[PDB]
């Protein structure tokens, strides 16, 4: 059986602010600009539709120097940093971006018609854009976060795949990763493994994997290390209705209708997709620069960041605006030409994290050790390299960041206020 | 470039089994249709198939006459003929719908023809 | 005279908690694919439009393994489960869907026009895509639920029904399959028995029949067991003012206009149609993943499961995203080809029922045979085959499921929190 840290976990008087200086990222809002010979990133992409994965390295508070060590015994037992407030600072003005595609597959405008439609020929994409829908969410955790996205399942081994047949589905959990996209509105799938076509959506997620967090499955976790907080706001409306073109992978069932003639004769395609939109961003509808209080979880683990990390998942697009920014080539004529300027976009991002941490103790009695050995064995193991190497995040660390007087700062301020004592 | 079979000679009764093969384009995404000619006389519909799932449509004429199939690993249509008469002797032709899985816009491409003697 | 179930039910001490790992569901947005030849279903119909009704299986708590059974006495009484709490998790990400139809009958536009429309022809169908009214609803009872729609009435024996005549209608209840579709913004009617035309709603609705849930009947129901409980948040708006090709089939009296002359001489249909909108989708208003605590029923049955049964209807349209797939015929040329990639469409549901359910006796006593025998006569037969085997559900067993640690559980630490002890 599990038990809240409530049990084990004794909760010391001692609290410390921690803090980032203030992240900055800047990049191009669609792909990574590159050297065409080469391979090495000249400029990242940095989109506000890309999910920001905080990996916070906390100082071991075992190896810390506290000014008074009378607080416990270190041979009975052990420290841990419990995490009691967060404020994830953003900075950049309010704003919505917007992404597209040069060749998106767009057949018709089948949101109203006065007449059939043509023919489709060779190649009959346009260069269109949107404005993606809009989401923030916040995920905490002492454990990096999960996702769920549909990709390409193994096939069955019968019916040998005839080329162009339709590809398996499979919901995949993941972990969400530093960079990783977010649902833009089409929802939460691997469109490279899933659209040969390459032009259904814009360029951005065009041969990416957008993905959702699996958020059942995180809070039906055992422990609940994944996640012990979270806040989510998504919306989006219906802007443009479409048609796709290709060729009929299914047949509409011709139970379902009348057959025409003439121009009506053959079926135009019945492939529909909406354009997404995500609505006015605005101030009152903020979740961030807001302080959050983790006192009760609704998982067993409240806020201890077991190993001394710290995970803080964010995703923004209320401030997604991209900004276009021209070089001319010549500074000479006095006549506008399309060919003396060359266009850019770039887009920035602007973070500022703030925690407000409690010293907690463990006294290592042999029911504490044989549990928390269970739960995970590296805790003890580490008490008295990186095992997840292979993925990626945004590393923050506040090692020497940790600071006594929450008077100093803001976040503690509103922490000492809000708690009274 | 379609190929059809060779002369076939059947005694009334009978059955035969004609191929048509294709070849220079993508089979997996046309139908097939075949028609019927008798002696110094006109052209006559018999049916079409969809090779995929072997869906096809029948002239009412050739309904238990005719049954359409197709081997899409090798690109190749069937038509198979039952209870064979006199009046069944004639040149078979199998031709390409032009737009892919429609049947409009005529029939660009013809096979060679394949002639069934019924005596 | 019916009596609160409080009457006769005795609560216990005992609460289980119970669970479905995760309900998945994947298939064609529109219309189910199968072997034209044949009749199996290769791939299924799955939209966020239609109706999940769940058919939930217990284990008999008078068979069940307690570990403890002084609680009672199995000569004077009988256990029953009593439904508390519910969680209807669901987890894809939000987002809104799209139906239409290749040859929809939609003559003229007619929210604005500079110039009377030309004439009506043959064929003057669109290929048009809308997106459907919201709606989000959650249906509970131990009975399943009930739905009403317009229908085909019968005729009245006397004029002979000239052929085109307009049918009579007539308001038809029926149980609530799972699989059914909801009102999408043509109202609930059965468009296969009330449209020869085959063509006035989009594909997805077009032969089927829309349902909306009978609440009036269902809470006049003398005994409540059809639903105890429920949710319903639905909205609509007009995207677009349309026109009906096809011919009058009742005019328009001429007290109710000047005839007109030239062009407006004759009458353009005034048989108006919109289409329908739900507009924006949004966290805020989610209806689902919060926990409903079924304590004080408004009918006589407060969530007893008669039958070890129990009912929980569905209808999301917040997530409704479908996703269209395209797989390359060839992996050659490196020129877009419209014939070379054939295009798809699917869609996938995530759901996930969670239950806290509480023990309880009924001492059998000649009044309450009387009662319950009078109520629902199986009862008590079954106590020391299906009798909806005509009606399809999702089938859910939970017999393996029930576990007597709610603290295990994220609705059962939920349900401990909430009610204290």
């Known amino acids: 059986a599990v038990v809240s840290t409530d049990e084990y976990v004794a909760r010391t008087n001692i609290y410390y602010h921690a803090g980032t200086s203030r992240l900055l990222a800047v990049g191009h809002p669609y792909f990574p600009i590159k050297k065409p010979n080469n391979n090495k990133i000249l400029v990242p992409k940095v989109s506000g539709l890309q999910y920001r994965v905080f990996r916070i390295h906390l100082p071991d508070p075992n190896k810390f120097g506290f000014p008074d060590t009378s607080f416990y015994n270190p041979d009975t037992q052990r420290l841990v940093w419990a995490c009691v407030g967060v404020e994830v600072g953003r900075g950049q003005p309010l704003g919505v971006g917007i992404s597209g595609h040069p060749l998106l597959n767009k057949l018709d405008d089948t949101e109203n018609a006065s007449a059939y439609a043509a023919n489709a020929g060779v190649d009959n994409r346009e260069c269109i854009s949107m404005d993606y829908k809009q989401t923030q969410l916040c995920l905490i955790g002492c454990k990096p976060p999960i996702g769920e996205h549909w990709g390409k399942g193994s096939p069955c081994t019968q019916v040998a795949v005839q080329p162009g047949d339709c590809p398996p589905l499979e919901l995949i959990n993941t972990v969400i990763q530093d960079g990783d996209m977010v649902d833009t509105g089409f929802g939460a799938m691997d469109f490279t493994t899933l659209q040969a076509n390459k032009s259904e959506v814009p360029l951005d997620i065009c041969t990416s994997i957008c993905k959702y967090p699996d958020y059942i499955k995180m809070v039906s976790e055992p422990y609940g290390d994944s996640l012990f907080f979270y806040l989510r706001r998504e919306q989006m409306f219906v802007r443009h209705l479409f048609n796709r073109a290709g060729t009929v992978g299914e047949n509409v069932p011709d139970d379902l209708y009348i057959k025409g003639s003439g121009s009506t004769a053959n079926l135009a395609s019945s492939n529909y997709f909406p354009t997404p939109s995500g609505s006015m961003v605005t101030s009152d509808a903020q979740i961030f620069n807001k302080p959050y209080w983790l006192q009760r979880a609704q998982g067993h683990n409240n806020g201890i960041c077991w190993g001394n990390q710290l995970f803080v998942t964010v995703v923004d697009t209320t401030r997604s605006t991209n900004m276009s920014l021209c070089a001319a080539i010549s500074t000479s004529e006095t006549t506008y030409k399309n060919t003396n300027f060359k266009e850019y976009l770039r887009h920035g991002e602007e973070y500022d994290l703030q925690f407000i941490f409690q010293l907690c103790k463990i006294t290592l009695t042999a029911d504490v050790m044989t549990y928390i050995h269970s739960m995970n064995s590296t805790i003890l193991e580490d008490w008295n390299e990186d095992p997840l190497k292979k993925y990626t995040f945004w590393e923050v660390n506040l090692k020497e960041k940790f600071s006594a007087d929450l008077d100093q700062f803001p976040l503690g301020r509103k922490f000492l206020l809000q708690l009274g004592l | 470039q379609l190929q059809q079979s060779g002369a076939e000679l059947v005694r009334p009764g009978s059955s035969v089994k004609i191929s048509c093969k294709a070849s220079?384009?993508?089979?997996?995404?046309?139908?097939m249709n075949w028609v019927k000619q008798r002696p110094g006389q006109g052209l006559e519909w018999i049916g079409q198939i969809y090779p995929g799932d072997g869906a096809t449509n029948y002239n009412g004429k050739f309904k238990g006459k005719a049954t359409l199939t197709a081997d899409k690993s090798s690109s190749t249509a069937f038509m198979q003929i039952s209870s064979l008469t006199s009046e069944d002797s004639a040149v078979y032709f199998c031709?390409?719908?032009?737009?892919?899985?429609?049947?409009?816009?005529?029939?660009?491409?013809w096979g060679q023809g394949t002639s069934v003697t019924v005596s | 005279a019916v009596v609160s179930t409080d009457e006769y039910v005795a609560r216990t001490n005992i609460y289980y908690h119970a669970g479905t790992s995760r309900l998945l569901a994947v298939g064609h947005p529109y219309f189910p694919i199968k072997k034209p030849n044949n009749n199996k279903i290769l791939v299924p119909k799955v939209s966020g439009l239609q109706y999940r009704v769940f058919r939930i299986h217990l284990p008999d708590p008078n068979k069940f393994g307690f570990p403890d059974t002084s609680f009672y006495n199995p000569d004077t009484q009988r256990l029953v489960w009593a439904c508390v709490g519910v969680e209807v998790g669901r987890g894809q990400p939000l987002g809104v869907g799209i139906s239409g139809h290749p040859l929809l009958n939609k003559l003229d536009d007619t929210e604005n026009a500079s110039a009377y429309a030309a004439n009506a022809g043959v064929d003057n169908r669109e290929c048009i895509s809308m997106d459907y009214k919201q709606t989000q609803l959650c249906l509970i009872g131990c009975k399943p639920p009930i739905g009403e729609h317009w229908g085909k009435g019968s005729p009245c024996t006397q004029v002979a029904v000239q052929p085109g005549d307009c049918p009579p209608l007539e308001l038809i209840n029926t149980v609530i399959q799972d699989g059914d579709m909801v009102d999408t913004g043509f109202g609930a009617m059965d468009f296969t028995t009330l449209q020869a035309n085959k063509s006035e709603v989009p594909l997805d609705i077009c032969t089927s029949i829309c349902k909306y849930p009978d609440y009036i009947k269902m809470v006049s129901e003398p005994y409540g067991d059809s639903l105890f409980f429920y949710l319903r948040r639905e909205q609509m708006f007009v995207r677009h003012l349309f026109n009906r090709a096809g011919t009058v089939g009742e005019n328009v009296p001429d007290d109710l206009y000047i005839k007109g002359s030239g062009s407006t001489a004759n009458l353009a249909s005034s048989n108006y149609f919109p289409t329908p909108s739900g507009s924006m989708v949004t966290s805020d208003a989610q209806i689902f993943n919060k926990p409903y605590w079924l304590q004080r029923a408004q009918g006589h049955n407060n969530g007893i499961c008669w039958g070890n049964q129990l009912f929980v209807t569905v209808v999301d349209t917040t997530r409704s995203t479908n996703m269209s797939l395209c797989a390359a015929i060839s992996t050659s040329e490196t020129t877009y080809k419209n014939t070379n990639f054939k295009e798809y469409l699917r869609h996938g549901e995530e759901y996930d029922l969670q239950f806290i359910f509480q023990l309880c006796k009924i001492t059998l006593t000649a009044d309450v045979m009387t009662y319950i025998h009078s109520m629902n006569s199986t009862i008590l037969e079954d106590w020391n085959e299906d009798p909806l085997k005509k009606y399809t559900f999702w089938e859910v067993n939970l017999k393996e499921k029930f576990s007597a640690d709610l603290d295990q559980f994220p609705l059962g630490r939920k349900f401990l929190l909430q009610l204290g002890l």
């Open positions: 031709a390409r719908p032009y737009r892919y899985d429609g049947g409009v816009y005529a029939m660009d491409y």
């Open positions: 220079g384009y993508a089979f997996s995404s046309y139908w």
